[PDB]
Design an enzyme around this catalytic site. Structure first.
Site, PDB file in Angstrom:
ATOM      1  CB  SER A  11      14.043 -26.542   3.642  1.00 19.64           C
ATOM      2  OG  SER A  11      14.821 -25.816   4.575  1.00 19.64           O
ATOM      3  N   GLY A  12      15.729 -26.318   0.559  1.00 20.33           N
ATOM      4  CA  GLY A  12      16.208 -25.231  -0.317  1.00 20.33           C
ATOM      5  C   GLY A  12      15.048 -24.357  -0.761  1.00 20.33           C
ATOM      6  CB  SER A  13      14.760 -20.679  -1.273  1.00 21.23           C
ATOM      7  OG  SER A  13      16.047 -20.542  -1.843  1.00 21.23           O
ATOM      8  CB  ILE A  24      17.113 -32.218  -0.442  1.00 20.73           C
ATOM      9  CG1 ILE A  24      17.494 -30.861  -1.056  1.00 20.73           C
ATOM     10  CG2 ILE A  24      17.919 -33.371  -1.024  1.00 20.73           C
ATOM     11  CD1 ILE A  24      17.402 -30.807  -2.568  1.00 20.73           C
ATOM     12  CG  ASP A  31      24.071 -20.054  -3.497  1.00 19.90           C
ATOM     13  OD1 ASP A  31      24.322 -19.243  -2.562  1.00 19.90           O
ATOM     14  OD2 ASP A  31      23.077 -20.874  -3.503  1.00 19.90           O
TER      15      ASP A  31
HETATM   16  N1  LIG Z   1      22.795 -35.050  -2.409  1.00 18.32           N
HETATM   17  C1  LIG Z   1      22.616 -34.590  -1.174  1.00 18.32           C
HETATM   18  N2  LIG Z   1      22.902 -35.407  -0.130  1.00 18.32           N
HETATM   19  C2  LIG Z   1      22.706 -34.948   1.114  1.00 18.32           C
HETATM   20  N3  LIG Z   1      22.268 -33.754   1.512  1.00 18.32           N
HETATM   21  C3  LIG Z   1      21.989 -32.966   0.461  1.00 18.32           C
HETATM   22  C4  LIG Z   1      22.131 -33.298  -0.875  1.00 18.32           C
HETATM   23  N4  LIG Z   1      21.754 -32.234  -1.680  1.00 18.32           N
HETATM   24  C5  LIG Z   1      21.389 -31.301  -0.833  1.00 18.32           C
HETATM   25  N5  LIG Z   1      21.515 -31.676   0.483  1.00 18.32           N
HETATM   26  C6  LIG Z   1      21.209 -30.875   1.669  1.00 18.32           C
HETATM   27  O1  LIG Z   1      20.232 -29.916   1.325  1.00 18.32           O
HETATM   28  C7  LIG Z   1      20.650 -28.591   1.746  1.00 18.32           C
HETATM   29  C8  LIG Z   1      20.084 -27.560   0.796  1.00 18.32           C
HETATM   30  O2  LIG Z   1      20.211 -28.045  -0.567  1.00 18.32           O
HETATM   31  P1  LIG Z   1      20.189 -26.981  -1.774  1.00 18.32           P
HETATM   32  O3  LIG Z   1      18.967 -26.097  -1.509  1.00 18.32           O
HETATM   33  O4  LIG Z   1      20.078 -27.787  -3.062  1.00 18.32           O
HETATM   34  O5  LIG Z   1      21.510 -26.230  -1.665  1.00 18.32           O
HETATM   35  C9  LIG Z   1      22.177 -28.670   1.814  1.00 18.32           C
HETATM   36  O6  LIG Z   1      22.701 -27.783   2.794  1.00 18.32           O
HETATM   37  C10 LIG Z   1      22.422 -30.122   2.235  1.00 18.32           C
HETATM   38  O7  LIG Z   1      22.499 -30.225   3.640  1.00 18.32           O
END
Ligand SMILES: Nc1ncnc2c1ncn2[C@@H]1O[C@H](COP(=O)(O)O)[C@@H](O)[C@H]1O
Length: 292
Positions: A15-17, A21, A126
């Protein structure tokens, strides 16, 4: 669930805000992928921007590939190369304890990724353990940087003319690791990314930062609560009982002018000399590679 004809959406892995994913399958190529979904609601979604930045970064060591961008229904879709766990996940797995060797191994790569992003005319804004992922398979030893959600041009692509010094900024990143400059609402530059990495490194050493865990209903309040403790803690007290190099690093970063090019080599050299004096070898064996 499917996305178009070619992709299989599996279970949520983050989960990103900004979006969520999912682990997924490129059915047509027979490869596991990561798939980011953003709901469109205004006329300023931001995944289109993030993907355009990823594409300008491509052919970087520790930059994930982008496979597809487009839209289905009311969602923007970004399909990217699948990577391993985050350094936050690995930290938790290792009982929130990394050896000096693991911290120094990571430090060398994390400066290089930031450098590479700066070489492409962007700052990240970030920098946190969540946003660094180890690769899978043959790339198991490679530290990757992700999430260009908050990234911006700090110099002209053409001229290399730095952005002007400005104040009273929107406090938009993660407060635990924010530069003292970000806290005073000063526009971010290359020095702010590198300082944030400094706090990430001392986070791994200590297990936590002495300004952690402070409750706030608002993002503005989170920064302000943390700002008080952070600005009252000398670099020298924060890093006490750890190699001087962690002090020297944060000190160097805080001494940089707004529009100074960092000496990325010097900062790397600091941690390498400490690494060799301790008697460690660059074998790329992190604490978690020793799990039997
Ligand atoms: N390409 C990726 N492969 C695996 N895990 C990912 C990937 N992109 C994002 N994540 C996971 O999603 C979390 C949140 O993604 P984000 O909100 O885009 O920073 C990260 O802490 C990772 O654990």
């Amino acid at each position: 669930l499917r996305v178009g004809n070619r992709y299989r959406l599996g279970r949520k892995i983050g989960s990103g805000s900004f979006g969520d994913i999912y682990l997924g399958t490129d059915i047509a190529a027979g490869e596991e992928v990561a798939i980011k979904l953003e709901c469109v609601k205004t006329k300023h979604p931001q995944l289109h921007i993030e993907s355009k930045i990823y594409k300008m970064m491509q052919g970087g060591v520790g930059i994930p590939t982008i496979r597809w961008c487009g839209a289905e229904g009311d969602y923007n879709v970004m399909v990217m190369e699948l990577l391993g766990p985050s350094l936050e996940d690995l930290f938790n797995f290792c009982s929130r304890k990394f050896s000096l060797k693991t911290v120094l191994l990571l430090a060398d790569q994390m400066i290089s990724r930031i450098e590479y992003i700066h070489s492409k005319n962007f700052i990240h804004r970030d920098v946190k353990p969540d946003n660094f992922l180890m690769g899978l398979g043959k790339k198991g030893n490679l530290v990757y940087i992700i999430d260009f959600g908050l990234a911006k041009k700090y110099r002209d692509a053409r001229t290399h003319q730095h952005i002007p010094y400005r104040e009273n900024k929107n406090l938009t990143g993660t407060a635990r690791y924010a530069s003292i400059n970000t806290h005073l609402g000063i526009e971010q530059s290359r020095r702010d990314d590198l300082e944030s990495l400094g706090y990430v490194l001392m986070y791994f050493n200590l297990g936590s930062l002495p300004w952690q865990g402070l409750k706030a209903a608002t993002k503005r309040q989170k920064y302000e609560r943390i700002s008080e403790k952070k600005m009252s803690t000398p670099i020298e007290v924060l890093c006490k009982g750890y190699p001087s190099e962690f002090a020297t690093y944060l000190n160097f970063c805080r001494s940089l002018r707004f529009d100074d090019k960092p000496d990325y080599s010097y900062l790397r050299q600091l941690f390498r000399n400490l690494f060799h004096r301790q008697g460690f070898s660059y074998d790329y064996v992190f604490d978690w590679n020793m799990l039997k």
